[PDB]
Design a protein around this ligand. Sequence first.
Ligand SMILES: Nc1ncnc2c1ncn2[C@@H]1O[C@H](COP(=O)(O)OP(=O)(O)O)[C@@H](O)[C@H]1O
Ligand SMILES: Nc1ncnc2c1ncn2[C@@H]1O[C@H](COP(=O)(O)OP(=O)(O)O)[C@@H](O)[C@H]1O
Ligand code: BEF
Ligand code: BEF
Ligand SMILES: [Mg+2]
Ligand SMILES: [Mg+2]
Lengths: 457, 439
Amino acid sequence: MTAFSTLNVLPPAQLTNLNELGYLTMTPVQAAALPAILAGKDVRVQAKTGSGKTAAFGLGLLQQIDASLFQTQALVLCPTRELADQVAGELRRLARFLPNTKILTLCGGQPFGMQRDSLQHAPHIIVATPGRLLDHLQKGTVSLDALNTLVMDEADRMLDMGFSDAIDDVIRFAPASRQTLLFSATWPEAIAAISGRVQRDPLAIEIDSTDALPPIEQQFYETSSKGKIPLLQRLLSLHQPSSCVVFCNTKKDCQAVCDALNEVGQSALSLHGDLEQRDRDQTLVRFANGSARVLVATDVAARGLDIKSLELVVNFELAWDPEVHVHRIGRTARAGNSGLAISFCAPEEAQRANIISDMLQIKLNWQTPPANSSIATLEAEMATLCIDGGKKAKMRPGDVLGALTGDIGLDGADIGKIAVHPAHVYVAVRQAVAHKAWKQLQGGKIKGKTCRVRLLK
Amino acid sequence: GMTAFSTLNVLPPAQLTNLNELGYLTMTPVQAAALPAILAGKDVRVQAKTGSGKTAAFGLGLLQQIDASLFQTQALVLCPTRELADQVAGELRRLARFLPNTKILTLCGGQPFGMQRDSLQHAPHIIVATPGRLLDHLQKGTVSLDALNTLVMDEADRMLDMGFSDAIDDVIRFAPASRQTLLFSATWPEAIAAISGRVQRDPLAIEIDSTDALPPIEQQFYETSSKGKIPLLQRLLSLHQPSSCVVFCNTKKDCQAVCDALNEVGQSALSLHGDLEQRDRDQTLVRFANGSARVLVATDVAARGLDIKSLELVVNFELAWDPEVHVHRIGRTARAGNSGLAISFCAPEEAQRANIISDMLQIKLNWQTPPANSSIATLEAEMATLCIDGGKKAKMRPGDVLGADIGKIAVHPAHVYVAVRQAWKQLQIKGKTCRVRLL
RNA sequence: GGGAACCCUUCCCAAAUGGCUGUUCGCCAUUUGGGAAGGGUU
RNA sequence: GGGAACCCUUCCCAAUAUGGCUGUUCGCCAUUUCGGGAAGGGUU
Ligand SMILES: Nc1ncnc2c1ncn2[C@@H]1O[C@H](COP(=O)(O)OP(=O)(O)O)[C@@H](O)[C@H]1O
Ligand SMILES: Nc1ncnc2c1ncn2[C@@H]1O[C@H](COP(=O)(O)OP(=O)(O)O)[C@@H](O)[C@H]1O
Ligand code: BEF
Ligand code: BEF
Ligand SMILES: [Mg+2]
Ligand SMILES: [Mg+2]
């Protein structure tokens, strides 16, 4: 039985679901905030990165859901589309105990009409970005009149000056009689001091201080701005990370670093706001399932993204905000693992490095690189097939896996992550078998129907 | 005397060629008389006998005022039955071939409301509808008559009866006050004629034929008891051996009972009444029209408007309550210049109905003696109907589906019906393969 | 700077809504989905 | 009477309409239907 039983609130169906999902022990933040959340209290939570906040507020809000009432009862706000999709997926996993629970995500990039159509049957839980959610609110396709609880993940980001007007506009559509949860790994005392405007007598649950990170080893390298790309290529060759995320402060630098890494054959994809949304989603899929070694991103990937066993984070340029520095490195060392975060520091970034040293109360570990080091190739172990259909075509992972193991004649150990999206299914297969799987699935059949299959770039 | 459509001096050469292609060689009397005033924009109330071209008479008039570039509703036509609405729409489509990209939509019950709502996003130029579903669409804002030029009521004496009065009034409140209004019918009791002027604006009354001037229909009456009508009917069918026949009854119960009594004696008979599924009604009409059945037993849902080509025989199993309904029934035969036969049964209690018919038509009844009472003869259907899934939404023009072993081809919105000689397994078209059912 | 939204064009591809000759395998027309590329919004 | 429209219930069949469900497939459920039948009730 799972430790969650000590809460003495969750139904046995949810306890069994947690046991099946492997949630055998409550993380500190779950143990600390779930009583108060299930009691209906407003909370502002500060726990370290990759320590279970999603389940912390998800179990809480799921406990107060009436599946028979097809109106929206829970609303979760995220700062980026990929993070919205991610926490929506985790909530759907946590909601298996309660059958026929509709969890819908509302972000830009998707066409507005398909979402308007899916909203005719109101979803129980909405996970959303502020722009598209406010668009749907002003046009009367979403009602918050039945809203029990409103969650703001990355709440210090949702309450900054950028999102402030959009948030104030959204809350105007929400009841005053609502539970309001705020979760983050960082709380600048400014955003913390103003956060009371959206809550009603909240409990401050600050279990992890600002300097209490997960087991992340940090290393800093002095370098001129011009030497950074050579140094990055040499360091990637030295470390040989199974996966790595490189962060830049601008999309121009992001794409430039991606291209410079690819010209030396270090398998790299780029993720920033100028990409189309299909490209953003597919890029994240491919990096997560092993179809690329390095992901180069702007701060659109700094927060919340849960990439499993990510081995390395590199700060090409230190982030403007030390809070964002903490979130970047937090992409590694999640769910109890360790990680490494290398950071470059040019003379213009001295102030950023000093503020990081002060905030984390650590003496920075400056590494000198080897005198000479060659540049090595980094090839991806996997490649991603994109099958047309998704949840709209009722494709569950068992169908793709059984078709791959049987009819097409592929080994069960040559297929990695299966990610079922609303309109497509992404499969990871080893690079040797990729073209074979593509050609045979072309004229093959999954779940009886014949489908369209693309090999992603 | 003959008059060509060019004598109207209004119709474009495209429309003149279209009429010549469709076999409208010379105008009928109702066309020659009503079309000048209709094209001049006058409201008209028109009488003309059955099977004399009233449909084309008002259709050409309203098509002359359509602007195909403006994709709003500009012409509305109301019908008493769904099958008649479909038929009038089809004739209007054939007449509208001179005008490319002309949307004529039919709004009737039985068909789902959602597909019609979707089709209404691109507003049609012409709507042919029954008042129920049309009013349902109007009140729900899916149809707008703001740009309406012409409103037409076929079978207007029925459209203005007490049953349809309120629905019609409801529909008119959505239409513009400045509109052209055309009322057409084969019959006009002077009471309903007097009340009809409320929907019109200075109408012109054109009574082409006096009430007793019918098409060349031979009328024969038979005395019979109530029971025994079915035996006498079976015997008359065995005697005359009609290629196509229509049997009218006053009740759906009698209709279905007569239909099944005809079927159990081996006489191919279909039924048509309001208690049927709408797909069933449409398929029944298609099968009876293309020759897949010899006899059609129907209620007064088939009394008005329907144009079955070269229908050979009509019988009144029971005389209609109203003589106006009687003339509409027999009018199903002897259409477009053909002759016909109309046999009527007369029980003791319907004798006064027979007498009122005699007075209205100013004809003395020709009573006939019963022929014989032996050997119920067979009446096999010459054709059989197959249903292809596809229709107009699958872009199936008749030529695609397409010798002389196949009769009529009926291209519907969702299906295509074809009559073959007395195909399925070999078909089970236009590149794509399709589902085929045997009716 | 980085996210989070949108409007204005202007051409492709595909599909909703119709039109087109009783010897098929297609051609139009309007609309809306992305595929773009052009400018503008917070 | 006969048409032209519904509304209640209450069971079928159907709908990638809207969702839910085991990582060795070809399926199983839920709601809605401005989708079709049945079987009683009513209404215009
Ligand atoms: N109780 C638990 N036991 C084991 N794993 C857990 C537990 N709770 C969460 N996880 C997993 O650990 C990771 C933490 O993800 P996340 O919820 O995003 O942490 P955070 O939002 O605080 O950064 C996820 O993969 C989550 O599924
Ligand atoms: N001018 C014409 N020449 C030849 N046939 C015609 C002409 N006008 C109509 N018809 C045909 O004669 C029949 C009359 O159908 P219809 O117009 O509905 O008669 P009704 O006057 O009773 O409404 C139909 O087959 C129609 O196509
Ligand atoms: F704090 Be986590 F990475 F959302
Ligand atoms: F008068 Be007809 F038969 F429409
Ligand atoms: Mg998180
Ligand atoms: Mg007529």
